[PDB]
């Protein structure tokens, strides 16, 4: 693949195709659900867990 | 139980008045259980 100077070669974390990518597009409905979204509480589906939609890596350094 | 039968609408100021009358008539232990049931009913209907 031919490249010009200043063109993208690799994507870093939270970056897709040369764009900042801090999140995910997910199916959402706005409605009260039995008080589990009372005020700022949020109800989610298990598919976000086993789909690994919001799984992140965290590296802790011990010295 | 000699509760009046409301037949129009229950907004915020109406429910506050009813709770205060329930407290004065039934006491706090009764009204505490009534509050738990009314709270459950409101969440379910919403």
For chain A, what is the HEC assignment? CCCCCCCCCCCCCCEECCEECCCCCCCCCCCCCCCCCCCCCCCCCCHHHHCCCCCCCCCCCCC
Q: How far is CA B44 from the centre of its chain?
A: 15
- What is the resolution of the experimental data for this entry, in Å? 2.5
A8, A18 in Cβ contact below 8 A?
yes
Within 10 angstroms of residue A32's Cβ, the number of other Cβ atoms is: 14
Within 10 angstroms of residue A15's Cβ, the number of other Cβ atoms is: 13
Q: Do A32 and B46 touch (CB under 8 A)?
A: yes
- CA B29/CA B25 separation, integer angstroms: 11
List C-alpha distances in Å: A32 to B8, B36, B38.
24, 18, 16
Of A8, A2, A3, nearest in space to A20 by CA: A8
Determine the distance in angstroms separating the CA of A26 from the nearest CA of chain B, rounded to an integer.
24
What is the gyration radius of the CA atoms in chain B, in angstroms?
Answer: 11
Of the residues B41, B43, B45, the best mutation for testing chain A's interface (the one with the most A CB atoms within 10 Å of its CB) is: B43
């Amino acid at each position: 693949k031919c490249i010009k100077k200043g063109q993208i070669l690799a994507d870093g974390a939270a970056t897709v195709g040369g764009e900042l990518a801090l999140g995910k597009n997910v199916l959402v409905a706005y409605m009260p659900w039995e008080g589990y979204n009372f005020e700022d509480a949020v109800l989610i589906s298990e598919c976000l867990v086993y789909g690994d939609i919001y799984t992140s890596f965290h590296i802790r350094k011990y010295e | 139980a000699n509760l009046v039968f409301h037949n129009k609408v229950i907004d915020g100021t109406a429910i506050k008045r009813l709770i205060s009358r329930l407290i004065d008539h039934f006491g706090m232990a009764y009204t505490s259980h009534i509050l738990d049931q009314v709270k459950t009913l409101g969440f379910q209907q919403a």
